[PDB]
Ligand binder design. Structure first.
Ligand SMILES: [Cu+]
Ligand SMILES: [K+]
Ligand SMILES: [K+]
Ligand SMILES: [K+]
Ligand SMILES: [K+]
Ligand SMILES: [K+]
Ligand SMILES: [K+]
Ligand SMILES: [K+]
Ligand SMILES: [K+]
Ligand SMILES: [K+]
Ligand SMILES: [K+]
Ligand SMILES: [K+]
Ligand SMILES: [K+]
Ligand SMILES: [K+]
Ligand SMILES: [K+]
Ligand SMILES: [K+]
Ligand SMILES: [K+]
Ligand SMILES: [K+]
Ligand SMILES: [K+]
Ligand SMILES: [K+]
Ligand SMILES: [K+]
Ligand SMILES: [K+]
Ligand SMILES: [K+]
Ligand SMILES: [K+]
Ligand SMILES: [K+]
Ligand SMILES: [K+]
Ligand SMILES: [K+]
Ligand SMILES: [K+]
Ligand SMILES: [K+]
Ligand SMILES: [K+]
Ligand SMILES: [K+]
Ligand SMILES: [K+]
Ligand SMILES: [K+]
Ligand SMILES: [K+]
Ligand SMILES: [Mg+2]
Ligand SMILES: [Mg+2]
Ligand SMILES: [Mg+2]
Ligand SMILES: [Mg+2]
Ligand SMILES: [Mg+2]
Ligand SMILES: [Mg+2]
Ligand SMILES: [Mg+2]
Ligand SMILES: [Mg+2]
Ligand SMILES: [Mg+2]
Ligand SMILES: [Mg+2]
Ligand SMILES: [Mg+2]
Ligand SMILES: [Mg+2]
Ligand SMILES: [Mg+2]
Ligand SMILES: [Mg+2]
Ligand SMILES: [Mg+2]
Ligand SMILES: [Mg+2]
Ligand SMILES: [Mg+2]
Ligand SMILES: [Mg+2]
Ligand SMILES: [Mg+2]
Ligand SMILES: [Mg+2]
Ligand SMILES: [Mg+2]
Ligand SMILES: [Mg+2]
Ligand SMILES: [Mg+2]
Ligand SMILES: [Mg+2]
Ligand SMILES: [Mg+2]
Ligand SMILES: [Mg+2]
Ligand SMILES: [Mg+2]
Ligand SMILES: [Mg+2]
Ligand SMILES: [Mg+2]
Ligand SMILES: [Mg+2]
Ligand SMILES: [Mg+2]
Ligand SMILES: [Mg+2]
Ligand SMILES: [Mg+2]
Ligand SMILES: [Mg+2]
Ligand SMILES: [Mg+2]
Ligand SMILES: [Mg+2]
Ligand SMILES: [Mg+2]
Ligand SMILES: [Mg+2]
Ligand SMILES: [Mg+2]
Ligand SMILES: [Mg+2]
Ligand SMILES: [Mg+2]
Ligand SMILES: [Mg+2]
Lengths: 117, 271, 69, 55, 88, 103
RNA sequence: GUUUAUUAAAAACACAGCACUGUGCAAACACGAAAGUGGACGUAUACGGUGUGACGCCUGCCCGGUGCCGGAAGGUUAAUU
RNA sequence: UGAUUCAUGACUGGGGUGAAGUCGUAACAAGGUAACCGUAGGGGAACCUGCGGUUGGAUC
RNA sequence: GUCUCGUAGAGGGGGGUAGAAUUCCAGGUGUAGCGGUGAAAUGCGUAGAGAUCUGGAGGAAUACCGGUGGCGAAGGCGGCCCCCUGGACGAAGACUGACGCUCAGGUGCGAAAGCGUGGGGAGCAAACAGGAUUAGAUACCCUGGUAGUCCACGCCGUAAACGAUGUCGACUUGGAGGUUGUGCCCUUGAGGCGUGGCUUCCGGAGCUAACGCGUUAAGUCGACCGCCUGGGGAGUACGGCCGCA
């Protein structure tokens, strides 16, 4: 209920889904939306359009806080890397910063075995 | 060294000895000896209160300095010795002022080494300090639980404790059991590990070797009659019941700690 | 890739700059190659094949630059 | 000789994210590229240079 | 592993002069010094197979030089093995 | 008798103890017939990344020629000194006396 | 090695070895209205309980039932009020 | 009392040949999960799976 | 073959340390999904997951540099720092004086898996379980997951352990590169002229059944060793030796 006006949008763009979480600058979440939760399943859930719809829903969920400025942190290789940012800019927020925070081990743990399809 | 006996008799085929050619071969230091006669596991009502104890070799008690509070005066290790009373070896040490004491022997300690205790002692194996003055992450043994009470934790051969953290008046310790335990930082501890780590590799090899150590035979409850043990009975080998002690308490996982007074110091149980 | 949108900079320009910086950093290819474990023999085989292909293509280009169609 | 304390020189051979730039891009000789990599790793350890740009 | 000073001392002690670095006695003495010195290294590092290969090469080279010296001049060979404390 | 380059970083709250530590370490080196080729105090610098939640540290650089025993003792002192947050000892081919790029 | 003193000496009991499990020390546990005592002037490479029974090669599937261990959002529920 | 050699033995192990009956389709094309080597575990069967190795892999 | 000066190098053994990331634990914000696939389901989540921030524990591996790049007898070796230590190469000399080459038997080293004892265990993952697919699916796919992978010591002694090419030496047209030394010259630098070591690709003569090899030979010769003699049975049986198996 307290005004913030300075938030951070975290995009978790995986191959199967997009999770958009808007927090304040201290990392406390204010609202979230996901492509899977915005009425998309299966092959439709992992599209840029579903990610854009999720970004719009997250903006609507955080509308009460009166956020004006947004930093953006994108993590993952998923197809919803840029549609979410485009929707966030179209929703009226002022995109101040954009940063990639995809984790990269510096070697790290052994990955799962290759799939034989 | 760990030495396998040759099978010249069935009772020697499986024997494995721990042979240390550094222990003193002569007699112990007499002024630090006391007699200690045997109990057979019986209390002052004359009743057996711990089963399976009796006989075995006569043993003199060595007075061991677990407090390590003779501060500021260096001592030199004179010799290592066998102590029948414990798994660890002990070391006879001579202080500069001419006083002799027994200490638990840390791993690596040998005759001629120098040791010291107190707040200003060097961080070296065999030296004793309050844990307030020992670096976090260190390995220590013979750890006090109350300042000035004397060492009580990690005394058995090969054992040690890890100082994992230090917060305010307390340190957190990883014990050999796996428990994480808070202890006052004013409690003392000796640097290093208790020696004689090979102790657990010995193999007794025959029944008599347990009898030499004062251990009497265990009789299985399922080998008894019902009047004797909840497990007893049966025409043939029968069981059909949840395993219990001779007094009826479940004995395969049921927990028995109940100490609300000391619960506040257990950061994390061993499991 | 840290792209700070400067004043009076359009969002489309900022997005294109971010995309270019990500492509130059090559994070996507790194993630894709780290998704599953590659046996060391497989990695060596792939590196050798890429080097052989590059050299053979360069030689073929050199030969084809001196002929008429 | 490359000095791990020569931060100004070393910064020419790292990217914006802090990665070591390939010698095929910088035009550096191989023998000096190896010294550059060693110096950069030492500087990273001494915290004169960052491991990653997310610092 | 041998230092310059130790090498020069061995050369002076076993050669005709300080320039006699090539004599069989000098070579054998130098190899003996290196082998004895490495004994301590391999007492501590029992799994240093790669270095031990170089040590075994010194041993074989010394054996071949000694056999050559024995074939050529028996008296020099006897004096050298006595001085160096070698069984053969 | 080998040549070493020693860089150690002090917690900024203990910056006032830095001259004392420098004097003690140089005295320890010179006691065992050691030489100090170079000694620089870089003061407080901003760290490229946080260390123990800090963001600045007091840097000291030395170039000495000392026996291995005293070098090992110095490393032990660094390890057990709570003020020194990070140190680094390197061998150098020769003595270094010229001014570093920091100064 | 032990055993039914007095019809059973054995394939029974024990046994070194193995495993599960309890136990952070005023230990668990046991004798005891209690004070205390044994465990132990021991301290997890230690001590108790249980099963198996040198050694060699081994020890597969089932947690639905009974027990033990963990959980605590909900339902039900004692004295009390 | 041993050694060696020949014959023989309920039963049992795999092998070859013939013939094609039952069960699948492992390999040859990228053989439809690239194949193969050593090893280990599993499976009516060809085989499958893990770990390292090879190219005597198609496409790129 | 020895000595002197120097050079490059993931060569080996021991110890320490750094940052990224995964998992787990605790707490803050927050709310209905997460995860997975070709599509699903099993699984996880209102007992508050997933997401995000903070702190802690722990193991394993070292992004970028990085390269038909380097080192090593082969097997193999990759963050940084120290300690111990093996080999190679180059320039001028000085020294010894055939001290050499090869090697049955012997001995040593020898990936991964596996074995023994004691530790450790994050991630991965034989076996195993469930969900799918299918006619079936003891698989391929999914969700989990134990040995094992890690450490110390010992054993095992095998791999398409391959260049499917034994070691040593001499000789025989060329081109373009990589890497690492060193000499001389100039207008002094991505400079020019040489001379060594190792290495990649192409190709001449010659060789070869052909494919191809081609001064790093599969060309022309010498020294010594190992090995083959139609396919299957079979690298199997029996016997010996070795091994805990
Ligand atoms: Cu109730
Ligand atoms: K004892
Ligand atoms: K028994
Ligand atoms: K019974
Ligand atoms: K019975
Ligand atoms: K009976
Ligand atoms: K320190
Ligand atoms: K009898
Ligand atoms: K009996
Ligand atoms: K037990
Ligand atoms: K046996
Ligand atoms: K046996
Ligand atoms: K059950
Ligand atoms: K059950
Ligand atoms: K209740
Ligand atoms: K016969
Ligand atoms: K017969
Ligand atoms: K197949
Ligand atoms: K194939
Ligand atoms: K296989
Ligand atoms: K079947
Ligand atoms: K070296
Ligand atoms: K390391
Ligand atoms: K020979
Ligand atoms: K193990
Ligand atoms: K593990
Ligand atoms: K898995
Ligand atoms: K080792
Ligand atoms: K084997
Ligand atoms: K190959
Ligand atoms: K060259
Ligand atoms: K040159
Ligand atoms: K063997
Ligand atoms: K075994
Ligand atoms: Mg997956
Ligand atoms: Mg298919
Ligand atoms: Mg009485
Ligand atoms: Mg008992
Ligand atoms: Mg006793
Ligand atoms: Mg027993
Ligand atoms: Mg009976
Ligand atoms: Mg009863
Ligand atoms: Mg019966
Ligand atoms: Mg029954
Ligand atoms: Mg009962
Ligand atoms: Mg030499
Ligand atoms: Mg009797
Ligand atoms: Mg009778
Ligand atoms: Mg009788
Ligand atoms: Mg008591
Ligand atoms: Mg009591
Ligand atoms: Mg008592
Ligand atoms: Mg039995
Ligand atoms: Mg259940
Ligand atoms: Mg319960
Ligand atoms: Mg086949
Ligand atoms: Mg097929
Ligand atoms: Mg198929
Ligand atoms: Mg196939
Ligand atoms: Mg075979
Ligand atoms: Mg299987
Ligand atoms: Mg753990
Ligand atoms: Mg060297
Ligand atoms: Mg041979
Ligand atoms: Mg292995
Ligand atoms: Mg097994
Ligand atoms: Mg093992
Ligand atoms: Mg595990
Ligand atoms: Mg799986
Ligand atoms: Mg073979
Ligand atoms: Mg290989
Ligand atoms: Mg072959
Ligand atoms: Mg080479
Ligand atoms: Mg060619
Ligand atoms: Mg031919
Ligand atoms: Mg065979």
């Amino acid at each position: 209920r307290k005004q913030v006006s300075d938030g951070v949008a975290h995009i978790h763009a995986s191959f199967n889904n997009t999770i958009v979480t808007i927090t304040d600058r201290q990392g406390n979440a204010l609202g979230w939306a996901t492509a899977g939760g915005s009425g998309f399943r299966g092959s439709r859930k992992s599209t840029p359009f579903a990610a854009q719809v999720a970004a719009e829903r997250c903006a609507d969920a955080v509308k009460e806080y009166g956020i004006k400025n947004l930093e953006v942190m994108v993590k993952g290789p998923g197809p919803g890397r840029e549609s979410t940012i485009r929707a966030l800019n179209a929703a009226g927020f002022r995109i101040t910063n954009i940063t990639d925070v995809t984790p990269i081990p510096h070697x790290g743990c052994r990955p799962p075995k290759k799939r034989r399809v | 060294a760990v030495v396998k006996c040759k099978p010249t008799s069935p009772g020697r085929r499986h024997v494995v000895k721990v042979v240390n050619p550094e222990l003193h071969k002569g007699k112990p230091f007499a002024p630090l000896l006391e007699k200690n006669s045997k109990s057979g596991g019986r209390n002052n009502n004359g009743r057996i209160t711990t089963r399976h104890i009796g006989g075995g070799h006569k043993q003199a008690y060595r007075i061991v300095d677990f407090k390590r509070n003779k501060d500021g005066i260096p001592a030199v290790v004179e010799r290592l010795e066998y102590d029948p009373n414990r798994s660890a070896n002990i070391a006879l040490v001579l202080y500069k002022d001419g006083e002799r004491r027994y200490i638990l022997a840390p791993k690596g300690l040998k005759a001629g080494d120098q040791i010291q205790s107190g707040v200003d002692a060097a961080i070296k194996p065999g030296n004793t300090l309050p844990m307030r003055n020992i670096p976090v992450g260190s390995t220590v043994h013979n750890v006090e639980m109350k300042p000035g009470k004397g060492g009580q934790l990690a005394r058995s051969a090969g054992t040690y404790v890890q100082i994992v953290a230090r917060d305010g008046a307390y340190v957190t310790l990883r014990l050999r059991s796996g428990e994480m335990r808070k202890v006052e930082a004013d409690c003392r501890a000796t640097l290093g590990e208790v020696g004689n780590a090979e102790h657990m590799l010995r193999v007794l090899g025959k029944a008599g070797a347990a009898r030499w150590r004062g251990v009497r035979p265990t009789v299985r409850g399922t080998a008894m009659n019902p009047v004797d043990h909840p497990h007893g009975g049966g025409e043939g080998r029968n069981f059909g019941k949840h395993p219990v002690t001779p007094w009826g308490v479940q004995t395969k996982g049921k927990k028995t700690r109940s100490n609300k007074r000391t619960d506040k110091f257990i950061v994390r149980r061993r499991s | 890739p840290v792209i700070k949108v400067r004043e009076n900079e359009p969002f489309d320009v900022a997005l294109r700059r971010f995309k270019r910086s990500c492509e130059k950093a090559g994070v996507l290819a790194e993630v894709r190659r780290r998704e599953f474990y590659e046996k060391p023999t497989t990695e060596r085989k792939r590196a050798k094949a890429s080097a052989v292909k590059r050299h053979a293509k360069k030689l073929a280009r050199e030969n084809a630059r001196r002929t008429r169609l | 000789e490359i000095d791990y304390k020569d931060i100004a020189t070393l910064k020419n051979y790292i990217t914006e994210s802090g990665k070591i730039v390939p010698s095929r891009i910088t035009g550096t000789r191989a023998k000096y590229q190896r010294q550059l990599a060693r110096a950069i790793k030492r500087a990273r350890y001494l915290s004169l240079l960052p491991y990653t740009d997310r610092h | 592993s041998l230092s310059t000073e130790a090498t020069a001392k061995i050369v002076s002690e076993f050669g005709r002069d300080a320039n006699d670095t090539g004599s069989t006695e000098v070579q054998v003495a130098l190899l003996t010094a290196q082998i004895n010195h490495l004994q301590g290294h391999f007492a501590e590092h029992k799994k240093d197979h790669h270095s031990r290969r170089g040590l075994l090469r010194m041993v074989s080279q010394r054996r071949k030089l000694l056999d050559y010296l024995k074939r050529k001049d028996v008296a020099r060979y006897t004096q050298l093995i006595e001085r160096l404390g070698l069984r053969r | 008798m080998r040549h070493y380059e020693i860089v150690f970083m002090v917690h900024p709250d203990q910056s006032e103890q830095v001259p004392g530590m420098i004097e003690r370490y140089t005295a320890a080196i010179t006691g065992a017939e050691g030489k100090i080729h170079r000694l620089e105090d870089w003061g407080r610098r901003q760290l490229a990344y946080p260390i123990n939640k800090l963001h600045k540290a007091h840097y000291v650089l030395m170039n000495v020629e000392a026996p291995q025993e005293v070098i090992d003792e110095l490393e032990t002192t660094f390890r057990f000194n709570d003020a020194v947050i990070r140190s680094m000892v390197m061998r150098t081919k020769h003595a270094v006396t010229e001014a570093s790029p920091m100064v």
